Structure formats: structure tokens, C-alpha cells
Design a protein around this nucleic acid. Structure first.
Lengths: 190, 189, 189, 190
DNA sequence: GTGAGTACTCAC
DNA sequence: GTGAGTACTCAC
């Protein structure tokens, strides 16, 4: 119930906190939830599972809002801008999950989990390319450069900002100066 | 000279598929050829080894950036070379890249990451200095704040190294540099 | 009634290939249907559950032994039936035999094994009594001490049950009983 | 090693004690040896291996001595007598290891170990069968009854005495009254 | 839900 | 060699 979600909420908070640079032991996670280690296992079979649930929430949040953007906004460049802003905004709003997105928190857990995060990035990049491929249809002319190069370029930018947010103890917020940065990023869309 | 032997090994392990998880002293000592006991007669701790690795990263990079500034007069070409240098060094030293992106350091003392952040700040400060001299050198500078442009530049580098590490070194940082650079440079206005 | 359901399920579990290891209360509750806390409204402990299973074994065996004594007057015939009964009871109740041999009690409180040792002493004393009455009943008794002969008989029973358990119940206790009994009986001197 | 053997000796000793009816945790075995649990792992990869070492010892002792008996004793009945006496004598002087041989100590450990013990009993039983089959050749008149029945019958007696020794927490010594018991046991060899 | 535990690990 | 952990389990 609120207990399962509660554990998850405490895990994200520890991830966001200074404890997030260290492994989140079941002991430490249990202490933070206010219950015993055993209590944790009534709701999850493993710690691996808790990260899986956190990753599911990240994928759902991002994929669902990406589709929302695609249905509401039809301008290709506007689409690109909004998806990038959504990723940075989502990361900034959830520092602990960003720590999962950048791979850092997963260093202590199952290699499979980083695999999940890589698939999520591939999905996002795949959507980026698709948006780019509709421009010719949408406005008469496509981009001159390879969409695969442009999309990796956009994602590289997002991953770079998230990585900085993480190394800086979350001081370098991902959306800071977004308005001044986007124009620079868009200049690449040739 | 074991001090160097140990560091070399740690780097090799960092580069190997075993670099995605804790590098134990037992495994490191085994890798070298000695015992965990011999290991500690060259280093007080494991942190010391990473401190040594980090210092190696900083000298390699700062030393080469200075060479670039003395070898290349053009502002944009300077920027291109410094980025290429960061991406290139990362590609040629995957294990150390793992330290640069902070992943390998999750298993170690927090101040080691602060040391990496200092290197990044140092580099960003140099990128800012290069950009500011454009006006004096070539006449007209950049329309935008150098702080915005240099962070934009480093963000690109970190993103590329991050992908390199994520993909278990499959996505090469300098891959397609030729085509990526002009796009990055398009961001310098 | 639920009390019977639990005991029956415990016995079934002791009988399965899982009887070879600890029977957790979670898994026992699962088998039954109720929750773990429900279980504790019928039994204050797991130890009580085995006490119940041990009382069952004791009643069964002692009740059957008394019947034997009333239905059979021959001394040697009486010993044969008591041994067959023990072997047959064990065979038709694999799970309970695991208690009789002491293996299933390894995960439990030590007093339970002591209770099993009391059943065995009880059975051995009966065996002794049957033997002591041979003289008055048929004329001449045994040359050897009844204590030696009765323990010899129990040793054969425990050995047969022990093997039944080791072998994951493949070596049934009554297998070749008719061929074995005359051999065991040759020990009765 | 002194430490390796020391650990095994401590394990065997714990198995003989009041602790033997319970799980021999690494914590308890470590306290018994006088070292830390980690010290234990400098000598064994797992506790399973300590039990494996102990079974190897039981195996070797028994098989090596049975072989010696077969070379020192010509008479079939005498061979059978000495082998049964050896099995019981070994158990009596190694109470902790008998707890392994009866399968009780193994209830907490890997099932594979009980398999090794069963293999040992099968090896012993096959030797007894082999000794029994030789009676004909060696002295003319072999046994009237099947050797398989006779050997399982001897082994049942051994396993029966060892089980009692264990149940009783070693009060019913396996060799007590051996001399009065053997002729009864031999009376079965028909 | 939890105290106590469970085999096994790590840096030094 | 070992102190302090590791994720996970058990009976109640």
C-alpha cells in the first residue's frame, strides 16, 4: 500500500541525499523508513526489485509525457525542445532518480539494471530520431544532417547536464539557463 | 617501482569488464602478483591509489591543454583541440574515464569526486579564458556569456564520456568527431 | 479441525522431498491456506505442532502393540508382529518416520528428541516384558539377557528406518521382511 | 594446515557437544576456533567444504582400514566381525563425525553431502557383499541366503547402533557388549 | 511487524 | 588476522 510506495519514496530520498554517493544498504534503508530490515521484505523480494520499480516509474513518467508532447505539439523543433526540457526537468525534480539515470546509484546493484537504463535511453533516442524523420512530412523539408547524429547530439547534451547535476551534489540544476541554452542546441539541427 | 605496477593494474582492471564493480584489494594484489600485505607498503589506502590515478589524469590533460595554447593561435581551433583532447584521452584510457565520470568512485571516498570536480572546474575556467581572449585576438568576441558557452562545451564532453561508460565502452567519444565538432562549434555565438 | 489440517499438512510436507530441510512457518501456512499469524492461534509454537505429531506416533504404536499382545499368545510371534508394526508404521508414514529417526527434529527444540527417546525406551521395555514371559508361558526362557535381546531388536528397527530415510524413502522398511525376520529371530537365544 | 586441521577438529568437536544437535553457524564455529569468521575463509571457500573435508576423512579412514582388515584376516566370518567392529569403533571414538554419518548433522547443509554419505554406505555394503561371496571359494560352503540380504542386514545393525548412539547424545556406546552382540549378529549369516 | 540470525565479504 | 558490515531469512 502506502507502505510499498513509502519504501520507494525513502529510497529516492536517500538517493537524493548525501547518502546517495554510497551504497544504500538494507540496514540504512530500513533505518530511514522507520521499520526493520525484515519489514522491507514483506513488500519486496529483493533490493534489486526496489530499483526495478524506481526504473519502471522513470520510464513510465518519461515515455508517457513524451507521447503527451507528441500529441499536443506538432511543430518538430518545438517537439525536440519540449522532450529535452522534459528530461532535464524530470531529472531536476527527482535528484535521487537522476542518480539512477546517470548510472551512479546502480554501481552497487545488478548489472541488469544499468541494462534497463540503457534501453530507456535507446527508446528516448529512437523517439528523438522519429520526431526528426517527420519534419519533411510536416514542413516540406527534412534536416540536411543524419538524424542519428542529431539525436545522439541532443541526448549527449541531456546526459551531460544530468551528469553535472549529479557530480555537483545537485548544485548545477539541469534546467538552469535552459532558455539561453536551447537556442544553442537548436543551432545544431541542420 | 611496484607503486607503478599497482596503479597500472588498477587501471587495467578499471578498463576491464570488472571495472563496473568494486575493485577489491585482494583482486588487485592478485592481479599485480603480490599479496594484500605488499600492496599496503606502497599505499596507506586504496584512496591513495585513486588519488594517484586522478593526479595522473589531471597532469595528462592540463599539460596537453597548455601545449595546445602555445601551438594554436586560433580561438575556435583551440576549443576544437581541447574538446578533442578530452574525448580522445577518455577513449584511450577507458578505465580512467570511469574515474572521470565518477562511476568507479562510487566505491570509494567521497572527496575523490570533489577532486574530479576541481579538475572539471579547472578545465572549464581555461575554456572560459580561451573564449574571452577571442575579442582581443580576433577582434569580435562571442555574443553570449563565456560562462554559458564553456559549460555548454563541457556538458557535451561529459555527456559523451557518460555514454562511453554506459555502453561498456561501445559508444566511442571521438566517433564521428569530424561531423559532431561543427555542430558543437555552431553553439559558440 | 484447523488444528488437524495444519498437522496433516505438516506431515505431508515432512513426507515430500522438502521434508529433507526445515519446514518454515511461512511455507506451512501457505500449504494450509491461512496466514502465518492464523497458525499461531491454534499452536503457540512450531514445537507444539511436533509434540502433537509425536503424540500421534506414540498413541498409534502403543495402541497397536497392546492389541498384538491380546491377539497373539506366542512369544516369538509377538516380537515379530511388534517389529513388523514398527516397520510398517514407518513405511506408511514417511514424514513421521523423519521425526522417529530424529532428522526432522534437528530444526526443532531439543526436548522433542528426548520425547522420541522416551517412546523408544517404552517400546524397548515392552519388548523386554514379552521376552521375560517366555519361561512361564512356554517353559524355558532365553539364555541371554532380555536387555541385550530387546536392544538388538530395536537396533534392527532403527537401522531399517534410518536407511528408509537416507535413501529418500527408496529402501522401504518392510521390504523382504519375511526373509529378514527369521534372521533377526535367530538372535533370540 | 595447522589452522585448516584446527578448524576441522573444532567442527568435529562441536558436533559431539550439546551444540551438535543445532546448526553449526560460522559465528559459533569461529568462536570455538578462537578466530574471526573471516579467518575461516582464509582456509575454506565455504562451510560446505569443511563438511566435505570431514566426509573425506571418514571415507578414507573407513576404507583404508577395511582394506587392511582384508589383508590381515583370512576367515570370512572374522572379516565380517572386524569390519562391523571397525565401523562401530570408529563412530564411538568420533561422536561428532558419527552425527554426520547418521545424516543428522547434514540436515542444515547441502543435500549433496548426504549423497556422499549414502555413496559411502553403498561402498561399504558392496565390500561386505564381496567378502560374503568369497566364502564359497575360501572355505567350500558359501551362504545359503542371498549376500545382498545378508549385507544389508549387517549394515542395518551398524546403522541401528550408530543411530542410538546419536539419539542418546552418545550414552549408548556402539561397542558396548559387542562381544555378546556379535555372535547374535553372526547367527544371521546363513 | 521484528530481534536475532546466516553464510560470506571487504579494506587494512 | 579482523571489525563492521552485506542482502536476506526465520519463528513468533
Amino acid at each position: 500500500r502506502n507502505r510499498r510506495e513509502e519504501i520507494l519514496q525513502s529510497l529516492a530520498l536517500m538517493l537524493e541525499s548525501s547518502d546517495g554517493s554510497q551504497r544504500i544498504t538494507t540496514a540504512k534503508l530500513a533505518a530511514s523508513v522507520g521499520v526493520s530490515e525484515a519489514a522491507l521484505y514483506r513488500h519486496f523480494p529483493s533490493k534489486t526489485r526496489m530499483f526495478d520499480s524506481l526504473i519502471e516509474f522513470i520510464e513510465d513518467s518519461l515515455i508517457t509525457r513524451i507521447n503527451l508532447i507528441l500529441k499536443d505539439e506538432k511543430d518538430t523543433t518545438a517537439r525536440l525542445r519540449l522532450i529535452v526540457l522534459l528530461i532535464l526537468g524530470f531529472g531536476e525534480r527527482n535528484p535521487g532518480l537522476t542518480r539512477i539515470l546517470t548510472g551512479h546509484a546502480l554501481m552497487f546493484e545488478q548489472d541488469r539494471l544499468q541494462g534497463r537504463i540503457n534501453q530507456l535511453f535507446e527508446r528516448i533516442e529512437v523517439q528523438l530520431r522519429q520526431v526528426m524523420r517527420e519534419k519533411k512530412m510536416r514542413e516540406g523539408e527534412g534536416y540536411t544532417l543524419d538524424e542519428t547524429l542529431l539525436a545522439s547530439q541532443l541526448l549527449a547534451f541531456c546526459e551531460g547536464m544530468l551528469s553535472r547535476f549529479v557530480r555537483s551534489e545537485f548544485k548545477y540544476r539541469p534546467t538552469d539557463d535552459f532558455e539561453a541554452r536551447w537556442p544553442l542546441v537548436a543551432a545544431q539541427l541542420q
